[PDB]
Write a protein that holds these residues in place. Structure first.
Motif, PDB file in Angstrom:
ATOM      1  N   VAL A  48       0.991  -1.120  -0.073  1.00 41.56           N
ATOM      2  CA  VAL A  48       0.041   0.073   0.078  1.00 41.56           C
ATOM      3  C   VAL A  48       0.849   1.216   0.018  1.00 41.56           C
ATOM      4  O   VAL A  48       1.762   1.323   0.837  1.00 41.56           O
ATOM      5  CB  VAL A  48      -0.989   0.006   1.060  1.00 41.56           C
ATOM      6  CG1 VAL A  48      -0.326   0.144   2.456  1.00 41.56           C
ATOM      7  CG2 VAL A  48      -1.937   1.131   1.107  1.00 41.56           C
ATOM      8  N   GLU A  49       0.490   2.248  -0.951  1.00 42.71           N
ATOM      9  CA  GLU A  49       1.305   3.310  -0.981  1.00 42.71           C
ATOM     10  C   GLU A  49       0.547   4.576  -0.605  1.00 42.71           C
ATOM     11  O   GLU A  49      -0.735   4.590  -0.533  1.00 42.71           O
ATOM     12  CB  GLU A  49       1.805   3.592  -2.342  1.00 42.71           C
ATOM     13  CG  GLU A  49       2.888   2.740  -2.648  1.00 42.71           C
ATOM     14  CD  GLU A  49       4.082   2.583  -1.597  1.00 42.71           C
ATOM     15  OE1 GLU A  49       4.587   3.758  -1.614  1.00 42.71           O
ATOM     16  OE2 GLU A  49       4.410   1.694  -1.122  1.00 42.71           O
ATOM     17  N   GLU A  50       1.046   5.543  -0.099  1.00 41.64           N
ATOM     18  CA  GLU A  50       0.351   6.767   0.356  1.00 41.64           C
ATOM     19  C   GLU A  50      -0.238   7.463  -1.015  1.00 41.64           C
ATOM     20  O   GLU A  50       0.428   7.666  -2.032  1.00 41.64           O
ATOM     21  CB  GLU A  50       1.271   7.855   0.867  1.00 41.64           C
ATOM     22  CG  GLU A  50       2.080   7.135   1.874  1.00 41.64           C
ATOM     23  CD  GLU A  50       1.015   7.039   3.161  1.00 41.64           C
ATOM     24  OE1 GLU A  50      -0.183   7.615   3.058  1.00 41.64           O
ATOM     25  OE2 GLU A  50       1.490   6.304   3.873  1.00 41.64           O
ATOM     26  N   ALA A  51      -1.721   7.718  -1.023  1.00 39.54           N
ATOM     27  CA  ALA A  51      -2.465   8.268  -2.151  1.00 39.54           C
ATOM     28  C   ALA A  51      -3.534   9.105  -1.644  1.00 39.54           C
ATOM     29  O   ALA A  51      -3.749   9.238  -0.389  1.00 39.54           O
ATOM     30  CB  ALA A  51      -2.995   7.118  -2.670  1.00 39.54           C
ATOM     31  N   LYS A  52      -4.320   9.686  -2.698  1.00 40.06           N
ATOM     32  CA  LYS A  52      -5.321  10.676  -1.947  1.00 40.06           C
ATOM     33  C   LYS A  52      -6.409   9.668  -1.454  1.00 40.06           C
ATOM     34  O   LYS A  52      -6.996   8.936  -2.101  1.00 40.06           O
ATOM     35  CB  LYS A  52      -5.916  11.295  -3.089  1.00 40.06           C
ATOM     36  CG  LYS A  52      -7.228  11.916  -2.957  1.00 40.06           C
ATOM     37  CD  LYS A  52      -8.658  11.318  -3.536  1.00 40.06           C
ATOM     38  CE  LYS A  52      -9.664  11.935  -3.646  1.00 40.06           C
ATOM     39  NZ  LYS A  52      -9.414  13.159  -4.480  1.00 40.06           N
ATOM     40  N   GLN A  53      -7.048  10.117  -0.368  1.00 37.25           N
ATOM     41  CA  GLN A  53      -7.964   9.455   0.324  1.00 37.25           C
ATOM     42  C   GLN A  53      -9.018  10.615   1.161  1.00 37.25           C
ATOM     43  O   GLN A  53      -8.801  11.539   1.037  1.00 37.25           O
ATOM     44  CB  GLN A  53      -7.558   8.604   1.437  1.00 37.25           C
ATOM     45  CG  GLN A  53      -6.687   7.397   1.094  1.00 37.25           C
ATOM     46  CD  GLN A  53      -6.022   6.752   2.187  1.00 37.25           C
ATOM     47  OE1 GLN A  53      -5.945   7.317   3.269  1.00 37.25           O
ATOM     48  NE2 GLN A  53      -5.610   5.704   2.002  1.00 37.25           N
ATOM     49  N   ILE A  54     -10.480   9.972   0.990  1.00 42.43           N
ATOM     50  CA  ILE A  54     -11.449  10.808   1.609  1.00 42.43           C
ATOM     51  C   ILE A  54     -11.879  10.542   3.112  1.00 42.43           C
ATOM     52  O   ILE A  54     -11.960   9.402   3.634  1.00 42.43           O
ATOM     53  CB  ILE A  54     -12.386  11.062   0.889  1.00 42.43           C
ATOM     54  CG1 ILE A  54     -12.903   9.598   0.317  1.00 42.43           C
ATOM     55  CG2 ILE A  54     -12.001  11.617  -0.386  1.00 42.43           C
ATOM     56  CD1 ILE A  54     -14.447   9.246   0.014  1.00 42.43           C
ATOM     57  N   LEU A  55     -12.099  11.305   3.770  1.00 44.86           N
ATOM     58  CA  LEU A  55     -12.656  11.325   5.251  1.00 44.86           C
ATOM     59  C   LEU A  55     -14.061  11.276   5.324  1.00 44.86           C
ATOM     60  O   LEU A  55     -14.992  12.082   4.402  1.00 44.86           O
ATOM     61  CB  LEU A  55     -11.946  12.195   6.333  1.00 44.86           C
ATOM     62  CG  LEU A  55     -10.671  12.229   5.948  1.00 44.86           C
ATOM     63  CD1 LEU A  55     -10.297  13.573   5.241  1.00 44.86           C
ATOM     64  CD2 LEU A  55      -9.843  12.562   7.475  1.00 44.86           C
ATOM     65  N   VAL A  56     -14.806  10.673   6.364  1.00 41.09           N
ATOM     66  CA  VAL A  56     -16.214  10.549   6.410  1.00 41.09           C
ATOM     67  C   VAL A  56     -16.784  12.052   6.536  1.00 41.09           C
ATOM     68  O   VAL A  56     -17.838  12.699   5.903  1.00 41.09           O
ATOM     69  CB  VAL A  56     -16.587  10.024   7.602  1.00 41.09           C
ATOM     70  CG1 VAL A  56     -16.113  10.779   8.776  1.00 41.09           C
ATOM     71  CG2 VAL A  56     -18.204  10.100   7.705  1.00 41.09           C
ATOM     72  N   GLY A  57     -15.960  13.120   7.147  1.00 38.21           N
ATOM     73  CA  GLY A  57     -16.307  14.448   7.213  1.00 38.21           C
ATOM     74  C   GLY A  57     -16.403  15.064   5.695  1.00 38.21           C
ATOM     75  O   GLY A  57     -17.238  16.001   5.376  1.00 38.21           O
ATOM     76  N   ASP A  58     -15.214  14.927   5.129  1.00 40.50           N
ATOM     77  CA  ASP A  58     -14.962  15.167   3.668  1.00 40.50           C
ATOM     78  C   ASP A  58     -16.317  14.998   2.812  1.00 40.50           C
ATOM     79  O   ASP A  58     -16.518  15.611   1.758  1.00 40.50           O
ATOM     80  CB  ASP A  58     -13.835  14.771   3.023  1.00 40.50           C
ATOM     81  CG  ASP A  58     -13.328  15.313   1.913  1.00 40.50           C
ATOM     82  OD1 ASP A  58     -14.214  16.456   1.528  1.00 40.50           O
ATOM     83  OD2 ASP A  58     -12.485  15.042   1.148  1.00 40.50           O
ATOM     84  N   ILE A  59     -16.805  13.789   3.026  1.00 41.01           N
ATOM     85  CA  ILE A  59     -18.080  13.554   2.249  1.00 41.01           C
ATOM     86  C   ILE A  59     -19.256  14.625   2.405  1.00 41.01           C
ATOM     87  O   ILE A  59     -19.341  15.079   1.186  1.00 41.01           O
ATOM     88  CB  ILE A  59     -18.723  12.382   2.644  1.00 41.01           C
ATOM     89  CG1 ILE A  59     -17.859  11.051   2.759  1.00 41.01           C
ATOM     90  CG2 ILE A  59     -19.891  11.860   2.030  1.00 41.01           C
ATOM     91  CD1 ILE A  59     -17.196  10.965   1.178  1.00 41.01           C
ATOM     92  N   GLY A  60     -19.442  15.115   3.334  1.00 39.98           N
ATOM     93  CA  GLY A  60     -20.528  16.296   3.620  1.00 39.98           C
ATOM     94  C   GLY A  60     -21.415  15.929   2.656  1.00 39.98           C
ATOM     95  O   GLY A  60     -22.186  15.128   2.851  1.00 39.98           O
ATOM     96  N   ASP A  61     -22.058  16.923   2.223  1.00 43.34           N
ATOM     97  CA  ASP A  61     -23.372  16.629   1.026  1.00 43.34           C
ATOM     98  C   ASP A  61     -22.960  16.878  -0.380  1.00 43.34           C
ATOM     99  O   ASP A  61     -23.493  16.244  -1.305  1.00 43.34           O
ATOM    100  CB  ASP A  61     -24.333  17.628   1.596  1.00 43.34           C
ATOM    101  CG  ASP A  61     -25.717  17.415   1.012  1.00 43.34           C
ATOM    102  OD1 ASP A  61     -25.841  16.251   0.433  1.00 43.34           O
ATOM    103  OD2 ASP A  61     -26.529  18.175   0.927  1.00 43.34           O
ATOM    104  N   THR A  62     -21.767  17.277  -0.622  1.00 44.65           N
ATOM    105  CA  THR A  62     -21.295  17.395  -1.986  1.00 44.65           C
ATOM    106  C   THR A  62     -21.009  15.868  -2.903  1.00 44.65           C
ATOM    107  O   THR A  62     -21.225  15.808  -3.856  1.00 44.65           O
ATOM    108  CB  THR A  62     -19.952  18.143  -2.079  1.00 44.65           C
ATOM    109  OG1 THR A  62     -18.858  17.555  -1.265  1.00 44.65           O
ATOM    110  CG2 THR A  62     -20.337  19.676  -1.517  1.00 44.65           C
TER     111      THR A  62
END
Length: 166
Positions: free
Chosen positions: A49-63
């Motif tokens: 596994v390499e460091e890559a772009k990931q999203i957080l639950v908060g980042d999900i928001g409504d968008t």
């Protein structure tokens, strides 16, 4: 060479996080963040596994309608990779969460790279047991719609699916 490419045991390090996830409502509700990017090792014979772009639950928001959207948004255009998504669903009885190993490989991706992934395709698949089913993808348009991924589990009657409401 004959054995092909395999997957490193170090994988359990990240997979364990998803495997041992607490309720997405109470505890994981804050750490619901789930994403992992696998890349070919320098030796081109090990999968890590390499460091890559990931999203957080908060980042999900409504968008963002579905968390899987981020992955299909930045997914490889001319390469093969693996996608890990926490299958979530809700029913009139109760809701549960699981994991699904996704194999991403476009027809335009390097054949040599694809061969390496094919070798560890089963190695990583067998390495993961917490999964319920395996879903293969090879179309940007087909993967673009999270409906396919959620529908993988089936049961359109479910109140919730991949975060997308009924």
């Amino acid at each position: 060479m004959a054995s092909g490419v395999t997957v490193n045991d170090e994988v359990i390090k990240v997979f364990n996080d998803m495997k041992v996830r607490k309720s997405s409502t109470q505890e994981e509700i804050k750490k619901r963040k789930k994403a992992v990017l696998f890349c070919l090792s320098d030796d081109k014979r090990q999968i890590i596994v390499e460091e890559a772009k990931q999203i957080l639950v908060g980042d999900i928001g409504d968008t963002v309608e579905d968390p899987y959207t981020s992955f299909v948004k930045l997914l490889p255009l001319n390469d093969c990779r693996y996608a890990l998504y926490d299958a979530t669903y809700e029913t009139k009885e109760s809701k549960k969460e699981d994991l699904v190993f996704i194999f991403w490989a476009p027809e335009s991706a390097p054949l040599k790279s694809k061969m390496i992934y094919a070798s560890s395709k089963d190695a990583i698949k067998k390495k993961f047991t917490g999964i319920k089913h395996e879903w293969q993808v090879n179309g940007l348009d087909d993967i673009k719609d999270r409906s396919t991924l959620g529908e993988k589990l089936g049961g359109n009657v479910v109140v919730s699916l991949e975060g997308k409401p009924l």
